[PDB]
Amino acid sequence: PPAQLSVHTVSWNSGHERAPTNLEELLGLNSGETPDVIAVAVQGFGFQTDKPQQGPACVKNFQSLLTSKGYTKLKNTITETMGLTVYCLEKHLDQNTLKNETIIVTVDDQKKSGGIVTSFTIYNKRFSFTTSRMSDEDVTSTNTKYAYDTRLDYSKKDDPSDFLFWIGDLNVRVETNATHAKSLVDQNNIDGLMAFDQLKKAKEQKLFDGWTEPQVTFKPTYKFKPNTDEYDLSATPSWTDRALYKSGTGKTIQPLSYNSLTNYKQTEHRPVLAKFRVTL
Numbered sequence: 022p023p024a025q026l027s028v029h030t031v032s033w034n035s036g037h038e039r040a041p042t043n044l045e046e047l048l049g050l051n052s053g054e055t056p057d058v059i060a061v062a063v064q065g066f067g068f069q070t071d072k073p074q075q076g077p078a079c080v081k082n083f084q085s086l087l088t089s090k091g092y093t094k095l096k097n098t099i100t101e102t103m104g105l106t107v108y109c110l111e112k113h114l115d116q117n118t119l120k121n122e123t124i125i126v127t128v129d130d131q132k133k134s135g136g137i138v139t140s141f142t143i144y145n146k147r148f149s150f151t152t153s154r155m156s157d158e159d160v161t162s163t164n165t166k167y168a169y170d171t172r173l174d175y176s177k178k179d180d181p182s183d184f185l186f187w188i189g190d191l192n193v194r195v196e197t198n199a200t201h202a203k204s205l206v207d208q209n210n211i212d213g214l215m216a217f218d219q220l221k222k223a224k225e226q227k228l229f230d231g232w233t234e235p236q237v238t239f240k241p242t243y244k245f246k247p248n249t250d251e252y253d254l255s256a257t258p259s260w261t262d263r264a265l266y267k268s269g270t271g272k273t274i275q276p277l278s279y280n281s282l283t284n285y286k287q288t289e290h291r292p293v294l295a296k297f298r299v300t301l
């Protein structure tokens with residue numbers, strides 16, 4: 022058993038946009054790194070119906086590239102508004118130890134909000150990967166707008182997972198006016214603007230209890246005018262896509278890198294990539 026494994030996560034609230042052609046950058050492969058596990062979460066509209074017939078392109082392009090490197094897809098799950106894919110290096114898998122499971126939780130009767138958790142075991146350690154989506158208008162279990170639900174949190178089980186990641190647009194925003202937020206951005210006072218971020222408020226209500234975010238040192242990833250680096254100040258600039266981590270069993274998870282990918286400008290949000298090292 023290796024003593025450590027590397028995990029990359031990426032999430033993008035990509036809306037109606039199709040998978041780009043350069044995937045290596047998106048997945049953090051472009052520096053020569055070969056991580057053990059890769060999870061990709063997207064949020065948007067119409068993935069299941071698939072009017073545009075993008076599904077077959079996604080499969081082809083992700084499968085070509087990743088199969089080439091020795092990955093196997095453990096699971097792809099899509100609903101109308103969320104997608105979560107998890108890949109693992111083939112060499113790590115043992116069929117009768119894996120216990121691959123996915124639940125979907127749906128909160129509203131239109132099945133647009135909730136989340137997905139995919140869990141699996143390697144080297145006798147359980148990994149769980151969650152993504153979630155909530156809209157501002159929703160009635161929820163928490164009576165907040167945040168994309169949290171206890172059923173999605175595998176640290177609140179009697180047998181909690183060893184390594185947990187929660188990736189996506191949590192529907193946490195910066196709670197101040199757009200002029201002030203832009204001023205802080207222009208001065209590169211990232212910690213000053215993070216003071217207004219709603220994750221700490223959610224945590225005060227004991228949502229995302231004991232989940233940690235890596236230090237943010239990049240500018241808000243939303244809301245941009247498509248194909249520019251210009252903020253549309255009709256919304257307060259915010260950090261939308263986030264990566265949170267936890268261990269249920271006292272394992273060390275060390276973030277190596279956490280950054281937005283500013284080369285991807287096709288849309289209003291920028292994708293966010295995190296890299297972690299975990300000690301088994």
Ligand code: HEM
Nearest residue numbers: 035037038039040067068071075076079080083084097106
């Ligand atoms: C940048 C945006 C997107 C990203 C990053 C992305 C990512 C992914 C990934 C990683 C997979 C699994 C591929 C595999 O099999 O290895 C997938 C599958 C799929 N995607 Fe995309 N996707 C995007 C956009 C979309 C859009 C806009 C639609 C439809 C409106 C869509 C529809 C689908 C469908 C239907 C599948 C499953 C196909 C099947 O199982 O036959 N995706 N996507």
